[PDB]
RNA sequence: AGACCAGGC
DNA sequence: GAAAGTACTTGACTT
DNA sequence: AAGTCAAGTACTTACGCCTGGTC
């Protein structure tokens, strides 16, 4: 069917499970109410994407922008952390090219222990 | 996995006419002939194989495997196939045609003769944005009798005369009025050829003369070949190439009819199957075709092959066509007769009035009809018909029950086909072939019947049925009618109007149509009703009121030398009311 | 109204009309047939016995017009919201470069 | 058919057909020339328009370019007759919808 | 079956696609759009390219026109009407897609007849001049020098400028040099019709001598004005050798290109007729006196206009006659053996050349000898025509074609007697002779009007019909050859782009390999064809 | 292609014999289809008899649309139009 | 994930004329793509919001009604080069093949980009680094780098009813990438 | 299936 | 054998 | 010798629908 563009504002993984807990919040609301073929996907995102982050919040992930402004990393990288290998060493040196780079010695490591505050 | 699928309604705009060439029929080829004659039946059950008639070509019975596709006659519709012709055989139809753009084109060069500005002035003409079809008539004309005054070409060579066609379908073109008593370059070789004729054997040649020059189908397909792109818009031609331009108005290739077209004749009794005429034509066709190939090369002669070519563009013209079978030709066998009228196969069946396009494509049948004789009756008010019960258990109508229906409608179920209010046909809207009611069940099968479903009950009261007589004359001939239902067997009405039908009862007959969705059933009766058709259409007075009896009762009524009494007019009253 | 008394025969029914389905259907079989195809002719599907043809609507009467129902839904409650995505990922690149 | 003996049926003649045309009804010449006698449905493909089955289109072997609609068997029946014949009688398709 | 016999695109296509094939080869998409579009429709309009195929409007066809105009693909033509504004016109342009077909052909002949300088630096030099003339479809002469090295010598490449103004080849740039012939000969037309100050109505037929003769002097000024003009070529200002114009630029021409290989049929035939010592003899004469002779230029006035039935040979004797004039008058006097890389007088050679005519080469004047550009072409058409049938069929085809051409239009009679043995053998190519057109068929009848068969056969003539049966192998042998050609690069398409991305396992080079071949053959077997066209295409 | 607003219109106010023909056979049909009905139903059969009384209180939520030579399209609702 | 903006046309009966128009629309919508493949968009997931909805028409032979509408859908791709959380599920000698839990098993990096030293066995041993390696039911991140789109599906009744009484290319929407920076393919190396 | 004749309005 | 019309190959009369 | 107005011969259609028996 027609196609009014290739890709509008980014949309990472937060508000997914959030706005599919509306989906959820509307048709029988799985777990709870259990005492179509939607569910292909419904019971696929909240697995997948919950399972993760346990072994989330409202207000410190808006407040999370602080220290991830003032940082140059741009895009790419920016709403891709919040997710995959948070605060150990080497874990960040994968997504973001030129990880190390420019500034090493301590400015980098702010990153770590504010991603471990987090948890 | 699982892509999406899209679908969206479309109408129809426009068509396209024009001839197809050579790349389609290839294209849309499944088979090939080949074989020749010989409906090629294998010997054993006798099937037929290849050739003409063939397991996949379309399928003339009921089971028939068409190993294309599947399903047989319930699935497969038709397919097409080619045939070979040795050399160009002339067309028909467009023979006339063929003529005039044989016309404007010089023989020697084979291209326009026409100059400069004229036609720098006709090519601006057309492309008027706005143009009558009549407008083309007019200038296709013109230009073509532009080319008759000139005797000279242009830019090529020598020249040439004009092409009267004398003759049928034999193409000669009388070189003719040359300049009188002028000599010209080619004349002067002209005479100086017939020396060296007249010198050998003076018998001959002096004995017949004069017929100038011809033009042979295959060298005027040659002389065809030249010219491309230029301009081909003078001579009628637009050049968008799907086509490949008129190399086409001459047959080379053959769109060999399916079985769809005509079919092998079954039934009639006898233990056998039988041919139809047009498959007899085109498997005929095949060996007088494949003649000339085993021939012109071993074998015969110069002259042999002639005629029997000749007979080729005899029987192509007769197979879509008519008055063209008999150009100063007879079959012989045993001598004997000739004079079969029905052989004509497709320019006849197509032909208009009983054939095709009047009769059957416009002329069509209507499904749930009746016909009964009339008779009389008072008692019905206009607008109402009252339709006997027993023609009323055959004669159905649709009915999708939902959210009130649910009620009657499963009581209609198990009341069974026989009286009356009942039901002869069931559909579930899990799409079943389909639950007839007659040969059983009924019963719990009333019990479930979802809102989806669709079941056929016998017409009754308070339904809409348009009324007819079949020798239709004007407006008020068709009108619409509520329905009834009464004893014994006869389509009885109001004797308040024998006008639009202009009835003498006298045991006429009446068509009666019922309608089947309800969009269409309420257009009957809210247009096409009697109430509003109560005016004549052209006159603006009424058509229709008392009649006969009816006019001179009231006059003895109404007389000014009668009186009456309470206890009379009472019962008038009564009467009336 | 052309300009020129003529009509009704079948020399005279070919003035106006640019159908050959309508005029061969009154009368004549083979000519206008193979003429429309021989000029290479396109006209249209327009008139009335041309689509009892092709067994579609018709353009007069009762289909005149084109019915249409309401959508009844509100212009308001149709805009979009977006939270935390729009905030931190553009006005991070955004300060000082 | 008609007559007896196999089955029955009437009659709408084109001197009978003008007389619903001078009512100005669309609707009821719709079910009864068409869904009442013979409906028929038949694939087209909008590129090089001409009939096939299922979902191909013979010289153009795609199915993605083919439309289903539904159109009288005389119509079909017509256009086999003609096409075996040479003419071409190609047929093209546009949307009702979209404004 | 499958249709992979290629039947689907045999019949549809005569002329046309070759253009727009070759286009598409030198650029393709929107290139090939609009020229096979002003072929199909002929004269053409800006506006009307829009109107027919939604071409991608104004952006396209811009873009195109200029692109057509560098290389000269359109030819161009504006006017106006009574009514106000004004027109462009554009026709599909002379041959310059043909000469887009030849390329190095030309060049090669650019090469090989640079010779009198021997084996120099040349060879890199002119073929790096040449090069850049034929693509840019321009050349100024400054801005070409200034794409030349500097610290270096200039005239170096100069060396080699001057020299290719030379006697034919390359010639300046001139205003309306490209025009339709038709319409320069109306535009001409003015100022003759328009000229008459109300004189006299007396012998309308003077109208006739008035516009043609003053129209025949002032067509010969100009078609004569590209042809031999020194005035810019010869330019030679002190402090330097003989300099081209630095302003005036150049382009190249048909004259001695399409000449070169005339020659060179001429000597296929010669060869053959003669030894190879006889070949060079004549070949030496035809190298000098190639200059002044019109040859392929021979009609010139024929395209445009009416020749007559009365007044043909008036027209066609008036060019035979000035074709007597300048052969005769101008052509070299008697040499002696001039200078070549048998001693004493090799006139003797020629009287060898003489005594023996039938066909060709050396009938004479007294006093001076020189083979007539007239009459030489009707048994130049008669060989190769024969040479055709005879490497297509067999023997007896050839035998038969000439029987029909010694006396004329005669019946199977005499035929049978005086042809060699065998009747049905004969009707066997008799059909195979008349199978495609070439003899026609002979009507006359047999005493009847018309009636049926039986009637008297006689076979004859067809010399334009048996013409154009070679016209056709000009495009539908070079159609499938190119074409396949390109198939078979987007086939390896994907081969090809891993290959220059290079410039690695055994199969990839298999198939490079491959290609290459097909390629070096193919375009060998384009020109072999080439040359059997180009003698094809005259009478 | 775009619509003639409601302000201003050359088209007559009332309505034709044949749209009445259309209202009430495509009305009806929708409630075959099991639609729902926006008035009053008395005990009865049919889709069309309820149909002709959904038409007498002009319960009807359809808007007509007209077609002029040039395009210039239409707006017209049912309940709006007199007769 | 992503979110796609697209336009489409809705037939709605009459048996959903009771309820509210946003209600009916989004039902149909969710019967449109769901779990189904959008070409070239990439895969959707869910429906987001419901814009632009104008007036709908109806055709004289249904009864019916068809508007048409735009609307921005929830869709799944993450770039070029994104590294993503997964693990492998089935195996031969081609390379591993990692699957998402939550969306599809189609992502496949085969061993040409990976490590030097790994290599299949027919042993039933699955992999073998020169140091350690893994297999099934252990997580596994893994970066992507090619992405390819394919449709084909111009099956002839000829060559269709053959399969159908004698007895793969499903690439719908496929994914792969090359992991060979080091500290890809499992978690627990690190901490 | 394609045919005939009588006759009905 | 239908009759009614329409379309298509030849002569005086000029220039 | 073109441009000319008047002449001999050759063509497609002339009724809506049905209901009976006979080859
Ligand atoms: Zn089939
Ligand atoms: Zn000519
Ligand atoms: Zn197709």
Same mark, same amino acid.
């Given at each position: 069917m027609k196609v009014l563009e290739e890709r509008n504002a980014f949309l990472s993984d937060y508000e997914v499970l959030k706005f599919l807990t509306d989906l959820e919040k509307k048709h029988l609301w799985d777990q709870k109410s259990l005492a179509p073929e939607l569910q292909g996907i419904t019971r696929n995102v909240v697995n997948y994407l919950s399972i993760n982050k346990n072994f989330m919040s409202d207000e410190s992930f808006a407040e999370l922008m602080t220290k991830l402004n003032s940082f140059k990393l741009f895009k790419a990288e920016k709403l891709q952390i919040v997710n995959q290998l948070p605060a150990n060493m080497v874990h960040l040196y994968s997504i973001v090219e030129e990880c190390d780079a420019r500034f090493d010695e301590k400015t980098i490591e702010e990153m770590l222990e504010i991603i471990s505050g987090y948890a | 996995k699982e892509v999406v699928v899209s679908e969206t309604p479309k109408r129809i705009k426009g068509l396209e006419?024009?001839?197809?060439?050579?790349?389609?029929?290839?294209?849309?080829?499944?088979?090939?002939?080949?074989?020749?004659?010989?409906?090629?039946?294998?010997?054993?059950?006798?099937?037929?194989?290849?050739? $003409?008639?063939?397991?996949?070509?379309?399928?003339?019975?009921?089971?028939?495997?068409?190993?294309?596709?599947?399903?047989?006659?319930?699935?497969?519709?038709?397919?097409?196939?080619?045939?070979?012709?040795?050399?160009?055989?002339?067309?028909?139809?467009?023979?006339?045609?063929?003529?005039?753009?044989?016309?404007?084109?010089?023989? !020697?060069?084979?291209?326009?003769?026409?100059?400069?500005?004229? =036609?720098?002035?006709?090519?601006?003409?057309?492309?008027?944005?706005?143009? #009558? !079809?009549? *407008?083309?008539?007019?200038?296709?004309?013109?230009?073509?009798?532009?080319?008759?005054?000139?005797?000279?070409?242009?830019?090529?060579?020598?020249?040439?005369?004009?092409?009267?066609?004398?003759?049928?379908?034999?193409?000669?073109?009388?070189?003719?009025?040359?300049?009188?008593?002028?000599?010209?370059?080619?004349? #002067?070789?002209?005479?100086?050829?017939?020396?060296?004729?007249?010198?050998?054997? @003076?018998?001959?040649?002096?004995?017949?003369?004069?017929?100038?020059?011809?033009?042979?189908?295959?060298?005027? %397909?040659?002389?065809?070949?030249?010219?491309?792109? $230029?301009?081909?818009?003078? /001579?009628?031609?637009?050049?968008?190439?799907?086509?490949?331009? @008129?190399?086409?108005?001459?047959?080379?290739?053959? @769109?060999?009819?399916?079985?769809?077209?005509?079919?092998?004749?079954?039934?009639?009794?006898?233990? $056998?199957?039988?041919?139809?005429? %047009?498959?007899?034509?085109?498997?005929?066709?095949?060996?007088?075709?494949?003649?000339?190939?085993?021939?012109?090369?071993?074998?015969?002669?110069?002259?042999?092959?002639?005629?029997?070519?000749?007979?080729?563009? /005899?029987?192509?013209?007769?197979?879509?066509?008519?008055?063209?079978?008999?150009?100063?030709?007879?079959?012989?066998?045993?001598?004997?007769?000739?004079?079969?009228?029905?052989?004509?196969?497709?320019?006849? *069946?197509? =032909?208009?009035?009983?054939?095709?396009?009047?009769?059957?494509?416009?002329?069509?049948?209507?499904?749930?009809?009746?016909?009964?004789?009339?008779?009389?009756?008072?008692?019905?008010?206009?607008?109402?018909?009252?339709?006997?019960? *027993?023609?009323?258990?055959?004669?159905?109508?649709?009915?999708?029950?939902?959210?009130?229906?649910?009620?009657?409608?499963?009581?209609?179920?198990?009341?069974?086909? !026989?009286?009356? @209010?009942?039901?002869?046909?069931?559909?579930?809207?899990?799409?079943?072939?389909?639950?007839?009611?007659?040969?059983?069940?009924?019963?719990?099968?009333?019990?479930?019947?979802?809102?989806?479903?669709?079941?056929?009950?016998?017409?009754?009261?308070?339904?809409?049925?348009?009324?007819?007589?079949?020798?239709?004359?004007? *407006?008020?001939?068709?009108?619409?009618?509520?329905?009834?239902?009464?004893?014994?067997?006869?389509?009885? %009405?109001?004797?308040?109007?024998?006008?639009?039908?202009? $009835?003498?009862?006298?045991?006429?007959?009446?068509?009666?149509?019922?309608?089947?969705?309800?969009?269409?059933?309420?257009?009957?009766? !809210?247009?096409?009703?009697?109430?509003?058709?109560?005016?004549?259409?052209?006159?603006?007075?009424?058509?229709?009121?008392?009649?006969?009896?009816?006019?001179?009762?009231?006059?003895?009524?109404?007389?000014?030398?009668?009186?009456?009494?309470?206890?009379?007019?009472?019962?008038?009253?009564?009467?009336?009311? | 109204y052309k300009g020129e008394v003529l009509g009704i025969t079948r020399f005279g029914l070919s003035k106006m009309r640019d159908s050959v389905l309508q005029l061969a259907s009154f009368e004549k079989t083979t000519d206008h047939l193979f003429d429309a195809a021989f000029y290479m002719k396109k006209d249209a599907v327009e008139g009335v016995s041309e689509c009892i043809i092709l067994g579609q609507t018709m353009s007069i009467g009762t289909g005149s017009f084109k019915v249409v129902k309401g959508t009844n839904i509100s212009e308001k409650d149709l805009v979009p919201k977006r939270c935390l995505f729009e905030s931190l990922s553009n006005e991070a690149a955004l300060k000082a470069n | 058919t008609e007559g007896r003996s196999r089955d029955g049926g009437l009659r709408l003649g084109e001197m009978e057909r003008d007389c619903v045309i001078a009512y100005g009804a669309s609707q009821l010449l719709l079910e009864r020339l068409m869904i009442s006698s013979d409906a028929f449905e038949v694939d087209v493909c909008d590129k090089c328009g001409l009939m096939g089955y299922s979902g191909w289109c013979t010289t153009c072997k795609s199915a993605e370019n083919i439309i289903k609609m539904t159109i009288p068997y005389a119509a079909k029946l017509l256009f086999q007759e003609l096409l075996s014949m040479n003419i071409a009688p190609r047929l093209r398709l546009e949307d009702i919808f979209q404004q | 079956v499958m249709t992979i016999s290629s039947l689907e695109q045999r019949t549809l296509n005569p002329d046309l696609f070759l253009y727009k094939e070759l286009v598409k080869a030198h650029l393709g998409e929107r290139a090939a759009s609009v020229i096979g579009m002003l072929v199909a429709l002929g004269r053409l309009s800006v506006r009307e390219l829009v109107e027919k195929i939604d071409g991608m409007d104004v952006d396209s066809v811009k873009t195109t026109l200029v692109s057509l105009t560098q290389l000269r693909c359109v030819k161009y033509l504006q006017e106006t009407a009574i009514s106000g504004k004004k027109t462009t016109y554009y026709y599909y342009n002379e041959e310059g897609i043909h000469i887009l077909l030849y390329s190095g052909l030309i060049i090669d002949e650019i090469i090989t007849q640079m010779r009198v300088n021997?084996?120099?630096?040349?060879?890199?030099?002119?073929?790096?001049?040449?090069?850049?003339?034929?693509?840019?479809?321009?050349?100024?002469?400054?801005?070409?020098?200034?794409?030349?090295?500097?610290?270096?010598?200039?005239?170096?490449?100069?060396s080699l400028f001057v020299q290719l103004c030379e006697m034919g080849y390359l010639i300046q740039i001139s205003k309306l040099h490209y025009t339709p012939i038709e319409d320069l000969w109306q535009f001409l037309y003015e100022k003759h019709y328009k000229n008459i100050p109300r004189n006299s109505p007396l012998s309308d037929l003077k109208k006739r001598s008035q516009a043609k003769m003053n129209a025949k002097t002032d067509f010969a000024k100009i078609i004569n004005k590209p042809n031999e003009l020194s005035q810019i070529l010869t330019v030679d200002p002190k402090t330097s050798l003989r300099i081209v114009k630095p302003t005036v630029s150049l382009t190249i021409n048909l004259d001695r290109f399409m000449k070169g290989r005339r020659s060179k049929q001429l000597i296929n035939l010669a060869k053959t007729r003669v030894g190879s010592v006889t070949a060079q003899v004549y070949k030496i004469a035809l190298r000098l006196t190639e200059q002044k002779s019109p040859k392929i230029r021979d009609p010139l006035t024929q395209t445009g206009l009416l020749q007559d039935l009365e007044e043909a040979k008036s027209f066609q004797d008036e060019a035979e006659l000035v074709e007597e004039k300048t052969p005769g008058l101008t052509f070299n006097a008697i040499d002696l053996a001039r200078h070549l890389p048998s001693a004493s007088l090799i006139n003797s050679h020629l009287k060898i050349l003489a005594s023996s005519n039938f066909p060709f080469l050396n009938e004479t004047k007294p006093g001076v000898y020189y083979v007539p550009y007239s009459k030489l072409m009707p048994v130049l058409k008669s060989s190769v025509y024969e040479y055709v049938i005879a490497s297509t069929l067999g023997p007896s085809a050839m035998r038969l074609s000439r029987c029909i051409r010694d006396n004329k239009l005669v019946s199977e009679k005499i035929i049978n007697s005086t042809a060699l043995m065998k009747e049905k053998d004969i009707r066997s190519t008799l059909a195979s002779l008349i199978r495609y057109n070439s003899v026609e068929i002979q009507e006359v009848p047999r005493t009847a009007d018309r009636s049926a068969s039986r009637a008297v056969f006689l076979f004859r003539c067809k010399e334009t019909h048996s013409y154009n049966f070679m016209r056709q192998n000009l495009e539908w042998n070079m159609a499938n050859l190119l074409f396949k050609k390109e198939k078979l690069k987007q086939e390896n398409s994907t081969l090809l782009k891993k290959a220059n991305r290079d410039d690695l396992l055994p199969s990839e080079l298999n198939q490079l390999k491959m290609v290459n071949e097909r390629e070096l053959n193919v375009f060998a077997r384009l020109s072999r064809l080439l040359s059997l066209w180009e003698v094809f295409q005259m009478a | 292609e775009k619509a003639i607003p409601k302000d201003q219109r050359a088209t007559t106010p009332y309505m034709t014999k044949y749209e009445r023909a259309r209202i009430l056979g495509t009305r009806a049909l929708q409630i075959s289809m099991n639609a729902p009905v926006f008035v009053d139903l008395e005990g009865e059969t049919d889709p069309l008899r309820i149909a002709m009384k959904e038409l007498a209180e002009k319960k009807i939520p359809l808007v007509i649309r007209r077609y002029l030579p040039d395009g210039s399209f239409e707006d017209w609702s049912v309940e709006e139009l007199i007769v | 994930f992503i979110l796609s903006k697209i336009a489409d046309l809705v037939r709605i009966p009459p048996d959903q004329f009771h309820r509210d128009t946003i209600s009916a629309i989004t039902h149909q919508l969710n019967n449109k793509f769901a779990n189904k493949i959008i070409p070239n968009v990439g895969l959707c997931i869910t429906i987001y919001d419901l814009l632009t909805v104008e007036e709908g028409q109806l055709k004289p032979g249904d009864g019916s009604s068809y508007i048409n509408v735009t609307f921005r859908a929830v869709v799944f791709k993450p770039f070029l080069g994104e590294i993503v959380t997964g693990w492998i599920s089935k195996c031969t000698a081609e390379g591993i093949k990692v699957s998402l839990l939550g969306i599809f098993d189609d992502i496949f990096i085969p061993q040409n980009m990976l490590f030097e030293g790994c290599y299949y066995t027919p042993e039933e041993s699955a992999w073998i680094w020169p140091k350690l390696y893994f297999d099934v039911n252990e997580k596994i991140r893994f970066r992507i780098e090619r992405e390819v789109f394919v449709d084909v599906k111009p099956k002839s009744p000829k060559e269709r009813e053959l399969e159908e009484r004698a007895q793969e290319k499903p690439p719908a929407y496929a994914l792969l990438g090359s992991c060979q920076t080091d500290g890809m393919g499992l978690v627990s190396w690190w901490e």
């Open positions: - | 006419f024009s001839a197809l060439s050579a790349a389609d029929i290839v294209a849309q080829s499944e088979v090939e002939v080949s074989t020749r004659d010989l409906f090629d039946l294998e010997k054993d059950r006798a099937p037929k194989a290849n050739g $003409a008639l063939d397991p996949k070509m379309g399928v003339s019975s009921s089971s028939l495997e068409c190993a294309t596709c599947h399903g047989n006659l319930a699935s497969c519709h038709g397919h097409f196939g080619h045939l070979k012709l040795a050399l160009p055989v002339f067309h028909i139809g467009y023979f006339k045609a063929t003529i005039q753009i044989l016309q404007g084109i010089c023989k !020697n060069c084979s291209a326009i003769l026409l100059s400069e500005t004229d =036609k720098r002035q006709f090519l601006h003409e057309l492309r008027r944005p706005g143009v #009558d !079809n009549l *407008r083309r008539m007019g200038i296709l004309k013109k230009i073509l009798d532009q080319c008759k005054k000139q005797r000279r070409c242009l830019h090529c060579g020598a020249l040439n005369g004009v092409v009267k066609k004398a003759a049928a379908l034999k193409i000669i073109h009388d070189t003719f009025r040359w300049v009188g008593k002028k000599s010209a370059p080619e004349k #002067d070789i002209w005479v100086g050829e017939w020396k060296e004729v007249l010198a050998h054997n @003076p018998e001959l040649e002096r004995y017949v003369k004069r017929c100038m020059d011809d033009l042979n189908p295959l060298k005027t %397909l040659n002389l065809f070949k030249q010219i491309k792109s $230029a301009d081909c818009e003078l /001579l009628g031609i637009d050049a968008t190439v799907p086509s490949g331009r @008129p190399e086409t108005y001459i047959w080379r290739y053959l @769109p060999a009819p399916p079985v769809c077209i005509r079919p092998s004749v079954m039934m009639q009794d006898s233990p $056998a199957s039988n041919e139809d005429d %047009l498959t007899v034509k085109l498997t005929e066709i095949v060996w007088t075709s494949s003649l000339i190939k085993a021939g012109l090369d071993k074998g015969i002669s110069i002259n042999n092959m002639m005629e029997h070519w000749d007979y080729l563009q /005899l029987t192509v013209a007769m197979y879509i066509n008519s008055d063209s079978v008999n150009p100063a030709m007879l079959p012989g066998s045993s001598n004997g007769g000739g004079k079969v009228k029905p052989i004509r196969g497709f320019c006849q *069946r197509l =032909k208009g009035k009983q054939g095709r396009f009047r009769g059957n494509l416009s002329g069509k049948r209507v499904d749930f009809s009746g016909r009964t004789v009339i008779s009389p009756d008072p008692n019905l008010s206009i607008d109402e018909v009252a339709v006997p019960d *027993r023609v009323a258990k055959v004669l159905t109508y649709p009915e999708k029950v939902t959210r009130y229906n649910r009620h009657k409608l499963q009581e209609l179920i198990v009341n069974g086909p !026989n009286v009356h @209010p009942g039901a002869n046909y069931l559909l579930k809207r899990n799409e079943d072939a389909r639950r007839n009611l007659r040969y059983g069940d009924r019963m719990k099968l009333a019990k479930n019947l979802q809102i989806g479903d669709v079941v056929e009950r016998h017409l009754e009261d308070g339904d809409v049925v348009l009324f007819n007589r079949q020798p239709s004359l004007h *407006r008020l001939s068709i009108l619409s009618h509520y329905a009834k239902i009464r004893p014994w067997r006869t389509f009885r %009405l109001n004797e308040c109007v024998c006008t639009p039908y202009n $009835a003498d009862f006298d045991g006429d007959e009446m068509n009666l149509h019922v309608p089947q969705t309800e969009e269409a059933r309420a257009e009957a009766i !809210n247009l096409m009703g009697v109430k509003n058709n109560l005016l004549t259409p052209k006159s603006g007075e009424p058509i229709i009121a008392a009649t006969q009896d009816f006019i001179t009762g009231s006059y003895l009524i109404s007389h000014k030398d009668s009186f009456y009494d309470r206890a009379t007019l009472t019962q008038l009253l009564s009467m009336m009311s | - | - | 021997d084996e120099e630096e040349h060879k890199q030099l002119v073929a790096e001049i040449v090069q850049n003339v034929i693509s840019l479809g321009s050349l100024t002469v400054e801005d070409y020098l200034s794409s030349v090295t500097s610290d270096s010598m200039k005239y170096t490449i100069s | - | -």
